Amino acid sequence: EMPVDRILEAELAVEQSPNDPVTNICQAADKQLFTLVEWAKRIPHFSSLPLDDQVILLRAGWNELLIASFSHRSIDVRDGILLATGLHVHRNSAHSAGVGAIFDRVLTELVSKMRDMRMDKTELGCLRAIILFNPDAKGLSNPSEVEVLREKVYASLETYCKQKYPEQQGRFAKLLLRLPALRSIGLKCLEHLFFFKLIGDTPIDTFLMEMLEA
Amino acid sequence: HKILHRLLQ
Amino acid sequence: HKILHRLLQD
Amino acid sequence: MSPEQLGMIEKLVAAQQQCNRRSFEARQQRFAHFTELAIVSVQEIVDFAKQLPGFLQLSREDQIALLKTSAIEVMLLETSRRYNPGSESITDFSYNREDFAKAGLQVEFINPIFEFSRAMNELQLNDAEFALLIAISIFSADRPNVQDQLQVERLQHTYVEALHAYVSIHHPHDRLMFPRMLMKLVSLRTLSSVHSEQVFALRLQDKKLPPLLSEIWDV
Ligand SMILES: O=S(=O)(c1ccccc1)N(CC(F)(F)F)c1ccc(C(O)(C(F)(F)F)C(F)(F)F)cc1
Ligand SMILES: COC(C)(C)CCC[C@H](C)C/C=C/C(C)=C/C(=O)O
Incomplete structure (x- = not known):
């Protein structure tokens, strides 16, 4: 039904002049937007909800999905994060660009804790499936279908944490206590992309642009 | 919309 | 900082 | 699970279950009602x-920091108990949408508040699962400005594992009630945000009123 290996597979398949940090970030978000859809498509079952649902969930869930993915990929960067493009952003620039406070928030609540615990790649893939399967999304034909699928991940993942890590008692809850901060953090990051789009002075690209015009 | 759709197809 | 500190130390 | 866990839950229910009662258009005053209430x-x-x-242990700016931004989450959680599915309303007198909409709130902040209350009502949680869940909600490491982040994520954990145990024991055939519940905290981050945007909306009205409210909602 929701097997954890078919999730990590996806986690894996998607596996990879001047630098302004916001120009670099936006380019990076766009790049990834494309491969988001390709990661989505390999989530057991995602393929199969109605179009209009598949499109509400990628719209509602994309920013929190890119973030988790980059914090996770940023584990051995220091005071920083590693763009899909290879370029980096570090606190100094984050702070310059006015994004100081959630940038550190991203560092402290995600990159770091994703270090301290050594969250492995299945665990990430599953955290991202749980994220993608978002039953509060305004517009869904069948919110309980979405939620049943979600709950398929919860049981797959708990089960899995009892396999790979039987000595860590609550690791499954440690895993999910990341998603509430992921959510506040992701709401704030968006208000910044919104304000960067409106000033116009930051170069947005085709795909991310569509994501940002409701 | 437009772009997402056709990738989802 | 304030009416809270009063609800708290109390 | 442990009798220790079990006595801690019992003390919590009691803790809640007693706190839970010290008891309380020119019609702006409708609003200033809602105001009276949120103070309570x-x-x-x-x-x-x-x-x-x-909780008294921590630096009181911590226990400030935690109280300050847990408040709606907790108040939303209780609004979520205290909710009547046939009335589509919330309680001897009660509170419609049009009521919410009758004070100045008149946007959809309202629809979120009410959509959440029907979801949490359906869970059909009890006095233990609710308090348990409020106590997790209060010990959120990640609130704005907070010295002892490890202390908080740490007293969190006590409640978290107590509830995981409690659920395992009592929802033998529905063990996803745990990540199901736990996850409302996430939805609780969105509601709270929608509440600031609500607070923001009428502060260009102006209203602010209550010292206490502007104190938590940093106006
Ligand atoms: O006052 S509530 O009705 C309430 C009743 C009982 C217990 C707690 C709270 N309430 C509903 C909520 F879902 F949020 F819990 C509520 C809370 C906060 C507000 C407001 O902060 C204020 F001003 F009304 F107090 C505001 F409407 F401004 F946003 C309004 C209603
Ligand atoms: C400082 O944070 C901003 C708001 C500039 C970035 C917000 C995060 C969104 C998801 C933009 C994406 C950055 C990406 C997608 C990096 C990556 O994976 O390459």
Whole structure:
């Protein structure tokens, strides 16, 4: 039904002049937007909800999905994060660009804790499936279908944490206590992309642009 | 919309 | 900082 | 699970279940009603926190920091109990949408608040799962400005594992009630945000009123 290996597979398949940090970030978000859809498509079952649902969930869930993915990929960067493009952003620039406070928030609540615990790649893939399967999304034909699928991940993942890590008692809850901060953090990051789009002075690209015009 | 759709197809 | 500190130390 | 866990839950239910009662268009005043009310909660919430094993311990700017931004989450959680599915309403007198909409709130902040209350009502949680869940909600490491982040994520964990145990014992055939519940905290981050945007909306009205409210909602 929701097997954890078919999730990590996806986690894996998607596996990879001047630098302004916001120009670099936006380019990076766009790049990834494309491969988001390709990661989505390999989530057991995602393929199969109605179009209009598949499109509400990628719209509602994309920013929190890119973030988790980059914090996770940023584990051995220091005071920083590693763009899909290879370029980096570090606190100094984050702070310059006015994004100081959630940038550190991203560092402290995600990159770091994703270090301290050594969250492995299945665990990430599953955290991202749980994220993608978002039953509060305004517009869904069948919110309980979405939620049943979600709950398929919860049981797959708990089960899995009892396999790979039987000595860590609550690791499954440690895993999910990341998603509430992921959510506040992701709401704030968006208000910044919104304000960067409106000033116009930051170069947005085709795909991310569509994501940002409701 | 437009772009997402056709990738989802 | 304030009416809270009063609800708290109390 | 452990009798220790079990006595801690019992002390919590009691803790809640007693806090839970010290008891209380020119018609703007409808609004200033809602105002009177939210104070009563804010009161109860600090009242509850203080009683939590560990809370007076922390630097009181921490226990400020935690109280300050847990408040709606907790107040939303209780609004979620105290909700009547046939009435589509919330309680001897009660509260419609048009009521919410009758004070100045008149946007959809309202629809979120009510959509959440029908979801949490359906869970059909009890006095233990609710308090348990409020206590997790209060010990959120990640609130704005907070010295002892490890202390908080740490007293969190006590409640988290107590609930995981409690659920395992009592929802033998529905063990996803745990990540199901736990996850409302996430939805609780969105509601709270929608509440600031609500607070923001009428502060260009102006209204602010209550010292206490502007104190938590940093106006
Ligand atoms: O006052 S509530 O009705 C309430 C009743 C009982 C216990 C706690 C709270 N309430 C509903 C909520 F879902 F949020 F819990 C509520 C809370 C906060 C507000 C407001 O902060 C204020 F001003 F009304 F107090 C505001 F409407 F401004 F946003 C309004 C209603
Ligand atoms: C400082 O944070 C901003 C708001 C500039 C970035 C917000 C995060 C969104 C998801 C933009 C994406 C950055 C990406 C997608 C990096 C990556 O994976 O390459």
